[PDB]
From a paper:
[name] is a DNA helicase belonging to family SF1B of Superfamily 1 (SF1), which unwinds dsDNA with 5′ to 3′ directionality. We were able to crystallize the helicase core of [name] from the thermophilic bacteria [name] and Sulfurihydrogenibium sp., which are moderate thermophilic bacteria, living at an average temperature of 65 °C. [name] from these bacteria are named DdPif1 and SsPif1, respectively. The helicase core of [name] from thermophilic bacteria is very similar to other bacterial [name] structures already solved.
DdPif1 apo crystallized in spacegroup C2221 with one molecule in the asymmetric unit and DdPif1 in the complex with the nucleotide analogue [name] crystallized in spacegroup P21212 with two molecules in the asymmetric unit. Though solving this structure was not particularly difficult because of strong homology with the template structure BsPif1, used as a search model for MR, the DdPif1-[name] structure has a possible domain swapping between the two molecules of the asymmetric unit. Only one molecule of DdPif1 in the asymmetric unit is complexed with [name]. The nucleotide has a good electron density which was also checked with the calculation of a simulated annealing omit map. The main difference is the folding of the N-terminal part of DdPif1 (residues 1-20). This N-terminal part is not visible in the DdPif1 structure and may be disordered. However, when [name] is bound, the N-terminal part is visible and contributes to nucleotide binding. The adenine base is stacked by an aromatic residue of motif IV (Y183, Y186 or F187 in DdPif1, SsPif1, and BsPif1, respectively) and a hydrophobic site chain of a residue of the N-terminal tail (A4, V5 or M4 in DdPif1, SsPif1, and BsPif1, respectively).
Author numbering: 2 to 423
The structure:
């Protein structure tokens, strides 16, 4: 039911017929998710799909990288050879292994997959000779810190980011980018995002971005506070909910089978009040709401199990609990095949308090009106770009504090690596 872009048909050809080592990239919202959705279902295809984190795998209907390869948490590329492989026969059946949100996987973690695949498969070809499709826009790099949040492995890695994987320097994968925009296609905003990606920001860009700074906000309704501090975001949602009048409703999620309670999209104990600012987590088929749409609860119906909210201006919708599937790829020793099957179900309203969110937890979502916490002196490499990528237009963006071109410093380091990808 979707249009096939000229770069969409180029990517499905190189992946479904001339399948060899492809890399889908682009900007935030350019079609990479629907391209992967169109490959697995609504098309004749079979392949494993992996994601770095458990919550990422639940959204795309895949399974964790560590879960698929039975990797321990402490796995390093040096522990791969001294790692006893059971169920060795099953790995010779998997081809075209697709990884999603590739920018989020570590450098060492990606080389573990190569060395693991080289064991169960041809030991000379990269990744054991399996077709590697990587998706997830390239400039959504995870945040790093110098004193905090390190493991500092410096054996041969220039950086913990994905591109520093040694498998790349001995591989050819003919990268393909998705450059077509949508969804509040603010061109001036898009071009500023392009120059931040290119690290070619002009002084007029900084003047335009700083024009969105506001120390005061009248009618903050509809705005979501995007910060980096996981602590601060939780305080804002809870404080905003206490200041709301009305009965507190406690809705409980049904956890069937074997599901990871540490990867729940929305809390099992959902505390909501009529009037709360909530966020939809379901990306509806009829395009009424996307994953990240902000609404306001207008009524709660516990008996009928229906939560009513006006989606913005007046787009009133009725929401029922949604079911998430826990996908696990298993080798059927009887039918000799791999096709994926659910091991657990989590059912709960696709809703979450949306007064504030963190950059890490807002992955994949785009909002309409954001309040970005730019009180930090510096932004970790590529962390300002990901904050702006969570919004759809410059008119929706509000900055708490004015930034300078020195704030986007340490982007210079990574951009010289990302340009090497040719
Ligand atoms: N080729 C296309 N033709 C028509 N509509 C499209 C196309 N690609 C994307 N869209 C629309 O734009 C939305 C964004 O694409 P989507 O595949 O969801 O990427 P995303 O998850 O929003 N973020 P990203 O993976 O960075 O692109 C989709 O939900 C569609 O509504």
């Amino acid at each position: 039911k979707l249009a096939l872009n000229t770069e969409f048909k180029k990517a499905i050809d190189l992946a479904t017929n001339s399948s060899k080592n492809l890399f889908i990239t682009g900007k935030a919202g350019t079609g990479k998710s629907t391209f992967l959705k169109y490959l697995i279902n609504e098309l004749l295809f079979d392949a494993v799909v992996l994601a770095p984190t458990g919550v990422a795998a639940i959204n795309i209907g895949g399974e964790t990288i560590h879960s698929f390869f039975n990797f321990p948490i402490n796995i390093t590329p040096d522990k791969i050879p001294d790692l006893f492989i059971y169920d060795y026969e099953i790995y010779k059946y998997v081809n075209t292994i697709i990884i999603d949100e590739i920018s989020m996987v570590r450098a060492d973690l990606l080389d573990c997959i190569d060395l693991f695949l080289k064991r169960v498969k041809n030991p000379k070809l990269p990744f054991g000779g399996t077709k590697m499709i990587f998706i997830g826009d390239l400039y959504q790099l995870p945040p790093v810190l110098t004193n905090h949040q390190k493991k500092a492995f410096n054996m041969e890695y220039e950086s913990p980011y994905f591109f520093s994987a040694k498998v790349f320097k001995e591989m050819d994968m003919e990268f393909i980018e998705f450059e077509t925009i949508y969804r509040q296609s603010d061109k001036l905003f898009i071009d500023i995002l392009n120059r931040i990606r290119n690290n070619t920001v002009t002084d007029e860009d900084i003047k335009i971005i700083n024009s969105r700074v506001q120390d005061k906000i009248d009618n903050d309704d509809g705005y979501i506070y995007i910060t980096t501090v996981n602590k601060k975001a939780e305080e804002i949602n809870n404080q905003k909910l206490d200041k709301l009048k009305g009965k507190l409703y406690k809705l409980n999620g049904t956890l069937k089978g074997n599901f990871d309670e540490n990867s729940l999209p929305t809390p099992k104990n959902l505390h909501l009040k009529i009037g709360a600012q909530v966020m939809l987590l379901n990306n509806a088929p009829d395009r009424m709401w996307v994953n990240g749409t902000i609404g306001t609860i207008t009524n709660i119906f516990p008996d009928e199990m229906i939560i009513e909210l006006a989606l913005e201006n007046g787009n009133i919708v009725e929401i029922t609990p949604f079911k998430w599937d826990m996908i696990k790829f298993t080798y059927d020793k009887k039918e000799k095949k791999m096709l994926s099957e659910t091991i657990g179900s989590y059912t709960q309203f696709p809703l979450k308090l949306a007064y504030a969110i963190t950059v890490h937890k807002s992955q994949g979502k785009t909002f309409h009106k954001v309040i970005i916490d730019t009180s930090r002196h510096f932004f970790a490499p590529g962390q300002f770009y990901v904050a702006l990528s969570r919004c759809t237009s410059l008119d929706g963006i509000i900055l708490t504090k004015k930034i300078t071109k020195n704030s986007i410093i340490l982007d210079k380091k990574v951009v010289n690596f990302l340009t090497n990808f040719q």
